[PDB]
Amino acid sequence: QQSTFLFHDYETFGTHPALDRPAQFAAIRTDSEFNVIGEPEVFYCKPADDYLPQPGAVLITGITPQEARAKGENEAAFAARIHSLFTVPKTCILGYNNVRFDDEVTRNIFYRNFYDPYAWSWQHDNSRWDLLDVMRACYALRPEGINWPENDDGLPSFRLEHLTKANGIEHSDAMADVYATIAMAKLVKTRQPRLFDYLFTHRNKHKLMALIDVPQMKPLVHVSGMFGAWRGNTSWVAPLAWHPENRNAVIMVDLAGDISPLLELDSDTLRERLYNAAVPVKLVHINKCPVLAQANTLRPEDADRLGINRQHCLDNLKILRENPQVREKVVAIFAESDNVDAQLYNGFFSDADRAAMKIVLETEPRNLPALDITFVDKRIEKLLFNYRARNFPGTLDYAEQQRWLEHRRQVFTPEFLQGYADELQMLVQQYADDKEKVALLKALWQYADEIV
């Protein structure tokens, strides 16, 4: 079996990866050298009748709820198709902003439809990557040979459409974003070969672990969206401690920051603060392909370009090393909704509960009503009801139908429905000169009228 890349992208009906619903999934498989070896995989997800899309999302995607409903399969089948692609052995699953967005959509789709939300990304030698932080790393660390567009605010832009246009890459077609992401990968591989190889290799958590030296507070360069485009998303950081609960999270200090709150304030004040002096502390999640490298990877000329003050960072590093009591202080900081759709991270399920959920998954939907099985975790009863009612409404008995009707009633409150009508009317005035958007908004009104 050969190593492959699976490039993918979602179009969704809103910004919330848990509370909004997916509309469309697109993917294609390449070999290890980015040669396309698969057929385009494009399919839609039917939205259940307890949901209205965010109008803004539909204006961006151009996909109406009517179209996803008419072309889609139920979310159970949508999940099955995605799971089948993602679990082919030796697959690197990647996209553009997938770590923060698409992967969270995936986890939630799997969660709602009785798949393991996590196993897909690591089992059978699988992995994840994300070209967004690769582009950011290039801009900060090795900008030579790539054109770096500025947005309307005068800051470097990493929007996929800006980067393609700025570098002469054809960008238009449900597959447009996927092909654009492949082109980004080829771009960096060709123009910054050693950085590309370094970043690919260091997608693996164990390679990242080797860079981390807590006793020595060994400084690293870290490229992260959280740092801000104004400094090329980059700083020098040092590891203080590992997270008390989260096995994959290390606690970093931003050496370019103001460490005085860490020196002066107690752990209780600092916990309230990061939830007035800024607390220069962040978590780095080693399972989320963070960009980390030895400190000298950021060259002086580039530190100067990004406005990063080396002496300030060195002074802070010296102070922190002479005050190891700050380690316990940050550990103490991190020592620390009734909608089941929002409860993915309310904990892991027991081995027994997962085994039972696996039976739900592998049982014929028609045999679910009579399915004898036991759950402990309180989420599962509601997950199972929603699953059946949304995907297989023809299998509900009268009491279950009445339960679903009440559920819908509690979503479509008086405040929600008025707000929705108000937003559509506002948007049709705002975008009156845009004929495509006007037509989409009329479609949204018509869908809302039906789904009520």
Tokens 């090795």, residue located: 142
Q: Which does 9 bind (CB under 5 to 8 A by kind): ligand CF1, Mg ion, none?
A: Mg ion
Q: How far is the CB of 271 from ligand CF1 (least distance, A)?
A: 26
- What are the distances in angstroms from CA 429 to CA 65, 432, 434, 436? 21, 5, 10, 13
C-alpha dihedral, 139 to 143 to 145 to 149, nearest 10°: 40
Residue 314 binding target from ligand CF1, Mg ion, none, CB below 5 to 8 Å by type = ligand CF1
Best CA proximity match to 21, nearest among 418, 386, 396, 437: 386
Beta pairing, strands 127-130 & 22-30: unpaired
Q: Which does 295 bind (CB under 5 to 8 A by kind): Mg ion, ligand CF1, none?
A: ligand CF1
**Binding of residue 292 to ligand CF1 (CB under 6 A):** no
57 binds ligand CF1 (CB under 6 A): no
Closer residue to ligand CF1 (CB): 218 or 379:
218
Tell me how crowded residue 416 is: count the other CB atoms within 10 A of its CB.
Answer: 12
Q: Which two tokens stand for residue 198?
A: 């370094």
Query: Could you tell me which residues come within 8 angstroms of residue 5 by beta carbon, excluding any fewer than 6 positions away?
Result: 29, 30, 31, 32, 34, 91, 92, 94, 129, 185
CA 424 from chain centre, in angstroms, equals: 28
| 271 contact choice in Mg ion, ligand CF1, none (CB below 5 to 8 Å, kind-dependent) | none
Residue 56, CB-side half-sphere exposure with 13 Å CA sphere: 5
Q: By CB under 5 A, is residue 75 in contact with Mg ion?
A: no
Helix 176-191 vs helix 193-201: crossing angle, to nearest 10: 110
**Closer residue to ligand CF1 in complex, CB, 163/313:** 313
For the chain, the maximum distance between any two Cα atoms, rounded to a whole number of angstroms, is 71
Question: Which residues between 81 and 120 bind ligand CF1 (CB under 6 A)?
Answer: none
- Within positions 6 to 45, which residues make up the interface with Mg ion, using CB under 5 A? 9
Q: Which stretch binds Mg ion (CB under 5 A): 5-13, 198-206, 327-335, 353-361?
A: 5-13
Using CB distances below 5 to 8 A depending on partner kind, what does residue 313 bind out of Mg ion, ligand CF1, none? Answer: ligand CF1
**Residues 306-365 within binding reach of ligand CF1 (CB under 6 A):** 310, 313-314, 317
Q: Pick from ligand CF1, Mg ion, none: which does 41 bind, CB < 5 to 8 A by kind?
A: none
- Binding-site sequence positions for substrate: 11, 159
- Binding-site sequence positions for Mg(2+): 9, 11, 177
**Which residues sit at the interface with Mg ion, rule CB under 5 A?**
9
**Which residues sit at the interface with ligand CF1, rule CB under 6 A?**
218-219, 236, 255, 294-296, 310, 313-314, 317
- Binding-site sequence positions: 9, 11, 159, 177
